[PDB]
Structure formats: C-alpha cells, structure tokens
Amino acid sequence: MFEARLVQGSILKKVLEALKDLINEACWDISSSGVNLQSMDSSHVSLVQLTLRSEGFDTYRCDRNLAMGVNLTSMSKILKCAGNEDIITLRAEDNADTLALVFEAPNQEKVSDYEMKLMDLDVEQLGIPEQEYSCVVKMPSGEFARICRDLSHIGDAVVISCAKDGVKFSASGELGNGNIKLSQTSKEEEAVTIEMNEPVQLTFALRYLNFFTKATPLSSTVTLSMSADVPLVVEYKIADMGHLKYYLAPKIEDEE
C-alpha cells in the first residue's frame, strides 16, 4: 500500500511521456525508499531506469512494497487528463487491482480522479554496475535533442567522438555526411563540459536516441557517459527528486 502526493504534477506527466514510446508495459517498484522502474526495450538493445526518491514527494507513504504491472500507454492517457499545474496523487492498495491517480486543480474548483486497471506483468531486471566511463559530457537537454534529430536526417547512425575540449556527433548517408562539433565552454547559461579520461569514438543508432530525447522537458541539462565497446548512458536529472537514465548498446564496428 502506497500513497504519494506530488504537487509538481507535471513531473509525472513528463516522466511518462518520456517512457511510453520506448517501452509499452512495465513494473513500478514502490517501497518506503521510493519509486523506481527499470525495463529494456522490446529489442533488448536499450534500457531505461527511473528513480523517484520518496524525499522528493510532497507526501509519500508506504507500508509494504509493491510492483504494479502497468500498460504505460494507458497511464499515458490518464495523465493527459491532468493539467500541467494540478497536484497529482497516486495511491495503491495492497493486493492492488488498480492504481488511483488523483488530480487536484490549482483554481480550487475541479478535482479529477481515475482508477487505472493494473496488469499481470513480469519484467526482466538487470544489475547495472557502478563504473567509471572514459568520457562524460554534460550539455543542454535542448541541444543534444536537436543534434540527434537533425542527424537522423542525414543517416541512421551517429558517431560521437570525444577529446579534451570538444565532442563531435557526425553521421553519413545518401545525401552526404555531416558533423557537429561542440567546443567546451570556458560563466554562461548552459555550457558544455567534458570530463574525459581516455578519448572515445562510438557509434549508436539515432532511432533509439530520439526516443531518449522525449525526456528532454524533465531537465534543462543532460549528461552522456561513455566507454570503449559498452553502452552509452544518457541521463536526465529530475529536479531534486531523482533522475532518469537510458542505456544504449553500441553498434558493432570493424573488428572482423
């Protein structure tokens, strides 16, 4: 049984619009510690990890851990029924049959409530190990989101390169190829920062990245962590409540 009251309703809205297109169903991990959600995409080539700490909710109460099987698209619709300013509250009984989403409106007049039917679902879980990537880029959520979009027009694979003072996403295709160099800032609004140990040049499928970018409204800044021949970690920090990470396996390069 858990009940959470988030006055920043919209966060939830953003958090779902940021998950649905990439994964259809999933299991929410509610406990006294907070709310989490980790699932791979149907193709197992990508994986998202949500984390909402309980200290982040205006009110949070749990007396018995749960796991609600949810058809994210359905929850996506029900949240589209809450104004960006409403105070959202989630409440789920023990052997929960449904999840209750309540929307209180600012202008004390309207109050909506829904009961989303839950499902029997079994999501496979992974153990992501803490590791030190040999290149970490922190940049504007907006920019990274544009880079992936434009680049998806030239070709379908992006080649991120990273040195000590700049990073470069380039992609080739039918009409040609294109490069986009970001140079390290060095005060200002949102600057690009590279904390590189070893240089890197990876390849990733833009299709997948363009999904990750749906999470852009959750944070002004976005940070990419990368290494040799393993996954790329795209992270959006969610205010002072937690964060959201997407991991994307790389496209295998010439080693044949």
Partner 1 sequence: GIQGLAKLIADVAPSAIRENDIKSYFGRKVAIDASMSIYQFLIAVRQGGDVLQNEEGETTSHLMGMFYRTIRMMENGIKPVYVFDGKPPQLKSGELAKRSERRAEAEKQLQQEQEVEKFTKRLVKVTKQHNDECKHLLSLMGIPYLDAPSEAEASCAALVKAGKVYAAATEDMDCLTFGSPVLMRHLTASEAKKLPIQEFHLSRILQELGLNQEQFVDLCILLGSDYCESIRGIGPKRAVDLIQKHKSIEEIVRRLDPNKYPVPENWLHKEAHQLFLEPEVLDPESVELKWSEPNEEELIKFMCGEKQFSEERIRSGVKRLSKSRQGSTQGRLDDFFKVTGSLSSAKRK
| Residue 134 interacts with, from its own copies, partner 1, none (CB under 5-8 Å by kind) | partner 1
Is the Cβ of residue 41 or residue 143 nearer to its own copies in the bound state?
Answer: 143
207 lines the binding site for its own copies (CB under 8 A): no
What is the residue type of 246? Y
| Residue 240 interacts with, from its own copies, partner 1, none (CB under 5-8 Å by kind) | none
Burial of 57 (0-12, 13-18, 19+ CB in 10 A): buried
Is the Cβ of residue 81 or residue 230 nearer to its own copies in the bound state?
Answer: 81
- Read off the DSSP letter of residue 119: B
Is the Cβ of residue 58 or residue 229 nearer to partner 1 in the bound state?
Answer: 229
Q: State the binding string over 148-177 for its own copies (x if CB under 8 A, else -).
A: --xx-xx-------------------xxxx
Task: Say how many Å lie between the first and final Cα of the chain, rounded.
Answer: 53
Q: Residue 116: CA atoms inside 13 Å, Cβ hemisphere, count?
A: 24
Q: How far is the CB of 118 from its own copies (least distance, A)?
A: 9
What would the two tokens of residue 209 be?
């990245």
Q: How far is the CB of 53 from its own copies (least distance, A)?
A: 27
Is the alpha carbon torsion for 113, 214, 6, 49 positive or negative?
A: positive
The DSSP annotation for 35-85 comes to EEEEEE-TTSSEEEEEEEEGGGSSEEEESS-EEEEEEHHHHHHHHTTS-TT
Is the Cβ of residue 175 or residue 252 nearer to partner 1 in the bound state?
Answer: 252
Q: Which residues have a C–N gap over 2.5 Å right after them in the chain? A: 186
Binds partner 1 (CB under 8 A): choice among 119, 149, 220, 239: 119
Q: How far is the CB of 249 from its own copies (least distance, A)?
A: 26
The contacts of residue 142 (CB under 8 Å, 6+ apart) are 216, 220
What would the two tokens of residue 59 be?
């009110």
| Residue 127 interacts with, from its own copies, partner 1, none (CB under 5-8 Å by kind) | partner 1
185 lines the binding site for its own copies (CB under 8 A): yes
Is the Cβ of residue 192 or residue 200 nearer to partner 1 in the bound state?
Answer: 200
User: Contact positions toward partner 1, by CB under 8 A?
Assistant: 27, 29, 38, 40, 42-47, 66-69, 93-97, 118-129, 132, 134, 156-157, 197-200, 203, 205, 227-231, 247-256
